[PDB]
């Protein structure tokens, strides 16, 4: 029945990715004195399906100057990573329990950029290359601290396994102990997904659509899920990382309800941030992080290695 589990972790997510679009439209609208989609079915609950069919029956544009083989690999690579990087998440009991969960988290998160990379190159245009290279610049500043914050926070968890995160957070939230890191992790998770103040790669007002300029119909529709499935999964990563809920050993219902609510609350804040602030500049973004973020990471990581030894509070390895 393991295959049934695989679809049960894919299809329910896919509808969750679908309804994030409708929720974002309504959340953004109601934060705008607007109403949001409410004509497609009741309360606009049919809107994602309305856009769903249109895109997959939309004319999938093939640009002549594009390199076709690389053109099609990028949407496949973007979506494939998005789903497969859900599998180590410890929703009560993780689907794929591995001793190095967070390392696998970073690996496919780092693999994700090659979607916007190859697509940006294959589109063969000015706005295509501008978006792809600033996508390098946005993400080049990005893995260096993402690993450090992950290392510093987990250093008192005990290991890289995602399941044991719950045992560490059994008594109090992780955010109580590393709130300076949590704010900094949250900005980066807001940043790794190219969202809200850091959306240079898309840049509607300044790059029309960036990498997505020559991407229509399903090839576009695929790009939307990869972006939005990464939003939910990264927030779920933050929810377990910093706000690990209680887990009854006999009723996984309790953790599942609490964990999902935490992901919903965090994902709304992603839309909350997306509505409020303006958009940075890709030079300021890099300057913000390698001049202000990265120096704080090293000292905070310095603090979070010295702290367990000085307090005789090192965590068990097994």
């Amino acid at each position: 029945m393991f295959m049934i589990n695989i679809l049960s972790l894919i299809i329910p997510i896919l509808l969750a990715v679908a309804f994030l679009t409708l929720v974002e439209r309504k959340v953004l609208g109601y934060m705008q004195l607007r109403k949001g989609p409410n004509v497609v079915g009741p309360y606009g609950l049919l809107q994602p399906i309305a856009d769903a069919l249109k895109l997959v029956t939309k004319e999938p544009l093939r640009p002549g100057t594009s390199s076709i083989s690389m053109f099609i690999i990028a949407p496949i690579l973007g979506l494939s990573l998005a789903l497969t990087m859900w599998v180590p998440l410890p929703m009560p009991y993780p689907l794929i329990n591995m001793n190095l969960g967070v390392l696998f988290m970073l690996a496919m998160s780092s693999l994700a950029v090659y979607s916007i990379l190859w697509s940006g190159w294959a589109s063969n245009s000015k706005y295509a290359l501008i978006g792809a290279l600033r996508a390098v610049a946005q993400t080049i500043s990005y893995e260096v601290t993402l690993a450090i914050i992950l290392l510093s926070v987990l250093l008192m968890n005990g290991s890289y396994t995602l399941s044991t995160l719950i045992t560490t957070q059994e008594h109090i939230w992780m955010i109580f102990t590393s709130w300076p890191l949590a704010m900094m992790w949250f900005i980066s998770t807001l940043a790794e997904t190219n969202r809200a103040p850091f959306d240079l790669t898309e840049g509607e007002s300044e790059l029309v659509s960036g990498f997505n300029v020559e991407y229509a119909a399903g090839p576009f529709a695929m790009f939307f899920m990869a972006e939005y499935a990464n939003i939910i999964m990264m927030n779920a990563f933050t929810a377990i990382l910093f706000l690990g809920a209680s887990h009854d050993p006999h009723t996984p219902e309790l953790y599942t309800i609490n964990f999902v609510l935490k992901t919903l609350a965090l994902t709304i804040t992603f839309l909350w941030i997306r509505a409020s602030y303006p958009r940075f500049r890709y030079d300021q973004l890099m300057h913000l992080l390698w001049k202000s973020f990265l120096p704080l990471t090293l000292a905070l990581c310095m603090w979070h290695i010295s702290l367990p030894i000085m307090t005789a509070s090192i965590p068990p390895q097994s």
């Binding site: 959340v27 609208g29 109601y30 934060m31 004195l33 607007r34 909350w272 509505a275 409020s276």
Partner: peptide, 22 residues
């Protein structure tokens, strides 16, 4: 401790629970 950023978030949230002008 980002404050004017939080001032914006609290602003939009207050402007979230209003009555839409639509």
């Amino acid at each position: 401790l980002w404050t004017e950023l939080v001032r914006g978030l609290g602003m939009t949230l207050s402007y979230l629970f209003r009555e839409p002008a639509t």
